[PDB]
Amino acid sequence: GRPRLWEGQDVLARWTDGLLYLGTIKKVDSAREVCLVQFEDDSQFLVLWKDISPAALPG
Amino acid sequence: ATGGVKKPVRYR
Numbered sequence: 456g457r458p459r460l461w462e463g464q465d466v467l468a469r470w471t472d473g474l475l476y477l478g479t480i481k482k483v484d485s486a487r488e489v490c491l492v493q494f495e496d497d498s499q500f501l502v503l504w505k506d507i508s509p510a511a512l513p514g
Numbered sequence: 515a516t517g518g519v520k521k522p523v524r525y526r
Binding site: 467470472474475476477494495496497498 | 520522523524525
């Protein structure tokens with residue numbers, strides 16, 4: 456099926472405080488179903504696919 | 515971003 460997440464995509468990621476933060480996907484890890492997401496302070500963390508939403512879908 | 519600050523899209 457058409458990929459939902461990809462490298463370079465602007466996304467909202469749910470963090471461990473239960474809140475959403477703007478980020479950019481830097482790496483997709485398919486086996487682990489995670490992406491390395493770079494946040495607005497340039498910190499980079501693993502987030503599960505289900506906790507990532509695309510910022511914009513064309514539509 | 516260089517110098518950036520994380521803020522949540524919404525606060526509690």
